[PDB]
Amino acid sequence: SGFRKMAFPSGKVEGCMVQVTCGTTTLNGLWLDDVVYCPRHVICTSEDMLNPNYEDLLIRKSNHNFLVQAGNVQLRVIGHSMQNCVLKLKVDTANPKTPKYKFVRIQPGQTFSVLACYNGSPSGVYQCAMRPNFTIKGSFLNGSCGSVGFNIDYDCVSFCYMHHMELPTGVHAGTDLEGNFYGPFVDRQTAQAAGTDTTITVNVLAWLYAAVINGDRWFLNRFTTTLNDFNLVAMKYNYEPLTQDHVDILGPLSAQTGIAVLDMCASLKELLQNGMNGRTILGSALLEDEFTPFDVVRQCSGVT
Amino acid sequence: SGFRKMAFPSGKVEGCMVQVTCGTTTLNGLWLDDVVYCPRHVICTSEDMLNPNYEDLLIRKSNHNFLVQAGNVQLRVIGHSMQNCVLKLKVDTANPKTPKYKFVRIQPGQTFSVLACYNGSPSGVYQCAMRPNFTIKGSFLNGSCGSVGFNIDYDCVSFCYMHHMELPTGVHAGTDLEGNFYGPFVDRQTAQAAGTDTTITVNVLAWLYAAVINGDRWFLNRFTTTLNDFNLVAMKYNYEPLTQDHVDILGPLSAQTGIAVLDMCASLKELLQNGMNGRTILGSALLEDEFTPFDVVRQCSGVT
Ligand SMILES: COC(=O)c1cccc(NS(C)(=O)=O)c1
Ligand SMILES: COC(=O)c1cccc(NS(C)(=O)=O)c1
Numbered sequence: 001s002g003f004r005k006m007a008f009p010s011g012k013v014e015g016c017m018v019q020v021t022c023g024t025t026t027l028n029g030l031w032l033d034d035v036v037y038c039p040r041h042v043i044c045t046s047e048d049m050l051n052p053n054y055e056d057l058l059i060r061k062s063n064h065n066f067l068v069q070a071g072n073v074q075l076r077v078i079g080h081s082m083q084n085c086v087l088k089l090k091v092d093t094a095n096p097k098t099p100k101y102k103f104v105r106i107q108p109g110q111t112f113s114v115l116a117c118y119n120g121s122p123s124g125v126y127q128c129a130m131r132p133n134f135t136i137k138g139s140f141l142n143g144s145c146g147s148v149g150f151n152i153d154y155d156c157v158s159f160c161y162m163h164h165m166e167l168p169t170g171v172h173a174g175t176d177l178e179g180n181f182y183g184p185f186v187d188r189q190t191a192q193a194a195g196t197d198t199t200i201t202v203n204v205l206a207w208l209y210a211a212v213i214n215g216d217r218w219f220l221n222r223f224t225t226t227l228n229d230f231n232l233v234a235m236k237y238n239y240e241p242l243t244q245d246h247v248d249i250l251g252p253l254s255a256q257t258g259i260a261v262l263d264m265c266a267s268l269k270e271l272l273q274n275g276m277n278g279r280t281i282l283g284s285a286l287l288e289d290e291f292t293p294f295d296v297v298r299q300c301s302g303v304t
Numbered sequence: 305s306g307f308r309k310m311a312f313p314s315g316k317v318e319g320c321m322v323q324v325t326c327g328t329t330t331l332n333g334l335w336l337d338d339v340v341y342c343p344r345h346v347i348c349t350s351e352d353m354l355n356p357n358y359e360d361l362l363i364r365k366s367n368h369n370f371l372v373q374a375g376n377v378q379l380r381v382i383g384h385s386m387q388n389c390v391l392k393l394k395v396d397t398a399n400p401k402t403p404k405y406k407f408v409r410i411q412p413g414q415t416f417s418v419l420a421c422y423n424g425s426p427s428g429v430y431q432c433a434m435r436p437n438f439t440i441k442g443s444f445l446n447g448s449c450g451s452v453g454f455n456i457d458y459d460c461v462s463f464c465y466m467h468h469m470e471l472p473t474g475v476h477a478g479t480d481l482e483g484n485f486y487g488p489f490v491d492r493q494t495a496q497a498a499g500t501d502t503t504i505t506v507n508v509l510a511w512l513y514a515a516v517i518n519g520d521r522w523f524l525n526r527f528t529t530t531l532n533d534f535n536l537v538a539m540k541y542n543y544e545p546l547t548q549d550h551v552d553i554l555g556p557l558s559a560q561t562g563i564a565v566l567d568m569c570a571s572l573k574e575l576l577q578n579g580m581n582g583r584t585i586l587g588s589a590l591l592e593d594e595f596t597p598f599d600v601v602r603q604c605s606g607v608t
Contacts, residue, residue, distance in 0.1 A: 001444070001445075001470055001474035002441055002442045002443040002444060002474060002475075002476065003443055004428075004430040004432075004441075004442065004443035005309055005430060006420070006427075006428035006429065006430045006443060007311060007428060007429050007430070008428060008429075009314040009315075009318050009419060009426040009427075009428065009429055010313040010314050010315055010429065011313075011314055011315030011318040011319070011426075014313050014315040015315070115313060116310070117608070118606045118608050119608065121608035122313040122315075122608060123310075123313075123602075123603075123606060123607060123608045124308075124310035124311060124312060124313065124603070125310065125311050125312075125313055125314065125429055126308040126309060126310045126311070128308075137306055137308075137587065138306045138308065139306040139307055139308035139310060139603055140305070140306060141305075141604075141605075141606040142606075143606060144606070166305055170305035170306060170518065170519060171306075172306065214474065215474060275582070276589075278579070280590065283441065284588075284589070284590070285580075285588070285589035285590040286584065286588070286589040298427075299427075299428070299443055300445075301445075302422045302427060302445040302446075302447060302448070303427060304421070304422050304423065304425035304426060304427045
């Protein structure tokens, strides 16, 4: 029993973290096989960052300008290319600790673990979600760029995020491992405002199911609703619309608890309209939206 | 910027987790040097668990009755002893991945990371605190016993917790790595009620400092207080008393933010008396008490 905000074990990713230095800029890289992936803004002075022309800045850089250190040993860079907003540094040595891995671009609402690193050295691990506005709410200081976000399916690490940017509002933007930003963000020190940070409805429902499974039942009400009725309320409260695809995904949590998805929707509706009245659910005084349905299944069934 | 509930990187501990089986009971062990540490209740049938006599149950067990598996390879048990509520299984092979490590008994209020394991296989990592009633609020299913709690000081893992028990209320009890229970709990399936789960005052203050550092300032008030005045309010709200030792520990957070510890105490006092009024601090609608002052320093300074 008990339900915790849980990150994947970080060991497989710890073994992939290196320090990348270009001139006076040091950040983190991800070493998979004989390639080190890092944010292309490693090539920038903070001055460059105001209006960088990355192709033009890259002409001034050779293989030997990229200093890659894995622990306290230098890797030989034998090639480099720009893919979108990441640099791929070819090194002469395959990472001996390369895990099975995939590159996956996640959708808003999906959760992942971040291994926060400074100078290629891991400091901590935490669980994030891709927000509906394609930001993440991270914990990232100067030097944390190139820290990555990941999921693990048994023995295979799916890399979904690399850290690039803090917005003036202190929320975070970054790329998939093909260098493509999530959302409309760019690796430039310019005014970039995030859209509405809406609540991930399907995730709140999953967590309400988790609460029922763990004995927190006080919010279960006598009502049901429809998707259209629920969605009118959702809109009003800046919750993402719920689709039949979301209802389908929640099906196993419905089955386990014998609470129809639309019944839990009506319980959520009442919680939005009435508030918590100073009560908690799973030790939270707000509705948690950074557990996916699968996260709830995983933690409530003990997958390794 | 940003402030997250952050666990230590789990890699060093992942490398120490093994499966221990005695008869039909499988749980987790911790392999350090040539010793596997596990809960002594590995020897119990659930029937035994109602009134176990551990010395008497152990007479029926030999070295070969303890099956230790590290990944998919069996370790040879050449010795076994009971220390308090843990078994120490001597194996013929030193763990090649043994990190630098210490055994530390923590005080209530101290935080640590838990690597949740099933069948010697890590499923996730989360951040806990030793509650003032010597429980922890974990996420632990059947098979998770022998999962451990730890801190890392640079390269040295300090092991502070091993999981043993879920109380009828679904909170958790376990031991230090010398087999001594935290609090008055015993490894017996009997009625064991926890005391008052009080709020770790010094931890809430630290997190309020973290909030100021990250731009959440709305709760800063025009008041100050004294330890005695604050403590009258603390008592009323089931907050732990604040000592001059706690004030001393908060000193660096005071210095960084220029907010006197007693001023932040007066801000906390008003938050207890007035509530949050539907506002959040660092994305929480309650006062978070599972960050230590050092945790705040660590995350706000980027230690690795
Ligand atoms: C077991 O049913 C699920 O929760 C489930 C099924 C299939 C896929 C997922 N992935 S998710 C939570 O990101 O959308 C969850
Ligand atoms: C830097 O000042 C601190 O926060 C500090 C100093 C010394 C020790 C600690 N350990 S603790 C938070 O567990 O009580 C924190």
